[PDB]
Amino acid sequence: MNYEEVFSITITVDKPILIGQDDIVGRRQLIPIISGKVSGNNFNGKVLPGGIDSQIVRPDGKCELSARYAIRLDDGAAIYIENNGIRTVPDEYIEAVKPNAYYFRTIPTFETYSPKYKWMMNHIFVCCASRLPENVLLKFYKIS
Amino acid sequence: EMNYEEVFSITITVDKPILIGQDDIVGRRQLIPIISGKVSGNNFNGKVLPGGIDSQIVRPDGKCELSARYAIRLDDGAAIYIENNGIRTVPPNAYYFRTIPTFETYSPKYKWMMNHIFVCCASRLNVLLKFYKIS
Amino acid sequence: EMNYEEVFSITITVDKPILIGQDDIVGRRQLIPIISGKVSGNNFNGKVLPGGIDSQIVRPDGKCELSARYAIRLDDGAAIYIENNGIRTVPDEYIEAVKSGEFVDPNAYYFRTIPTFETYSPKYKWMMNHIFVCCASRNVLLKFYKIS
Amino acid sequence: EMNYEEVFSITITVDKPILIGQDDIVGRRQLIPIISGKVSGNNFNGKVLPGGIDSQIVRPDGKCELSARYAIRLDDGAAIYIENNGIRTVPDEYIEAVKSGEFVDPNAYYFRTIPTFETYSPKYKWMMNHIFVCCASRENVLLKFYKIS
């Protein structure tokens, strides 16, 4: 199995909007995306307004993540992204959750509006992520 | 033969669309921020919380597919997370505009929201949403 | 103020469940093959095609989440592909019976679903452009309503 | 970088397609029954159970969107329920072939999917807590499953 690292995004997030928590569904929060820098070989630009990661930390500590946001490239192209994934920590970090620690991986789906980016809607992708301060680093890999 | 009960309404104030892109294959994608919203109904009263976005695509044939993610808080302190998925088609009074919401709740008083099917009838002005519990 | 129209019904015969597995967090997963089915409704008459499966999970709290994929062929030769997703619940007194599978009175059930359609002719494209609700019961009888 | 582990393979025998319908906007929808299948991999050996269907649509532009629901039973008695969703494309020169369904060489395909698992035992709960990628090809479909580390 082969793959190609195609780009990265460093995203600056705002404080979580905590919606609610219990020990049946877990804890729901919305994470607003403030900004984001996109970079890669011929794939450079920024994250657009309107971005939100909708997250639930399940009672067992597993986080399920579903982000919806858009980017615009420096050539003028826009790409809409839905990024669906998981973040799990080992045992001594679980009550904290509810940095090297995490397993944090996602699958993005892309929607594009010009022939130059049609390939993004015709391959499978994996994203390897990390969180920091309040800014997640995302590496995107095209499955070859 | 199909019964239902109207359970609450939300009048939502939206910001201007964040247009992402458009072409003649996928259509036009935009994100609509929800500025605010008033929730009202029999023992179901409160407001829409921050962080709300309706993600819409207008298909080339004109059909709009809608998927909104937002939360509300009630005046009893209960919070509810809503994903509302539906369609809007035209040939204001013009539209067919109907959606299916899915609820996530965090207390026994509201768990019935996770155990029924619902339909939402909407109107685009702001947007007015009437929620019906299918009996 | 919500209007709807009954558009058709389907009476489905199903095989015995294919029990996959169960535990006390995810619940009980089973696949239900659809043997046959008859579609009827004003100018809407046909049959269920081969290949139909309802993938079901009865959650530890007793709620059944249903997802069926199947197709129908109408007497004019048109096909409709259906994914029907919904839920089936019972009052607390019947839950132990459900978790077993001992007989429960069909009137105990709340059994409602939301169908999505895929069609391949102009005469049926409306089914792709309205919202629908399905009221079901124990054959399985499904009644389909277009929301107006 | 991205690391991964091959976890197991499945070789599946499928029946003939159940053609539902086709048009030039939605494409061609068919249901593919899974007759049988053999699961193999280090400490991961079993069979596919009854009830498996791949629901597929070949879009007007030639791209096939695949969604399979089936289950396997391992030799230690554990079950795994699999929802496997993916895509299968060919170069432009083979698209017409893909359409009347003429022979296209196996090496021509891009055929990749993302499986989701449901398991009922602590020994296999890790399958619910990792991301996976599946590489597939075409007498059978060969699926190789990879855990993303």
Curated annotation (Swiss-Prot), chain A:
- InterPro entries hit by this protein: UPF0311
What Pfam families does the entry give?
DUF3237
Which Gene3D superfamilies has this protein been placed in? 2.40.160.20
Q: Superkingdom, according to UniProt?
A: Bacteria
Q: Which family does it belong to?
A: Belongs to the UPF0311 family.
| Name under which the protein is recorded | UPF0311 protein CA_C3321
Annotated organism of origin: Clostridium acetobutylicum (strain ATCC 824 / DSM 792 / JCM 1419 / IAM 19013 / LMG 5710 / NBRC 13948 / NRRL B-527 / VKM B-1787 / 2291 / W)
Curated annotation (Swiss-Prot), chain B:
Q: Which cysteines are joined by disulfide bonds?
A: none
| InterPro entries documented for this protein | UPF0311
Which Pfam family, giving just one, matches this sequence? DUF3237
Family according to the record: Belongs to the UPF0311 family.
Name of the protein in its database record: UPF0311 protein CA_C3321
Q: What is the lineage of its organism?
A: Bacteria, Bacillati, Bacillota, Clostridia, Eubacteriales
From Swiss-Prot, chain C:
Report the domain of life of the source organism.
Bacteria
Pfam families listed in its UniProt record? DUF3237
> Which InterPro entries is this protein grouped with?
UPF0311
Q: Which residues cross the membrane?
A: none
Which family is this sequence assigned to? Answer: Belongs to the UPF0311 family.
* Protein name, as recorded: UPF0311 protein CA_C3321
UniProt source species = Clostridium acetobutylicum (strain ATCC 824 / DSM 792 / JCM 1419 / IAM 19013 / LMG 5710 / NBRC 13948 / NRRL B-527 / VKM B-1787 / 2291 / W)
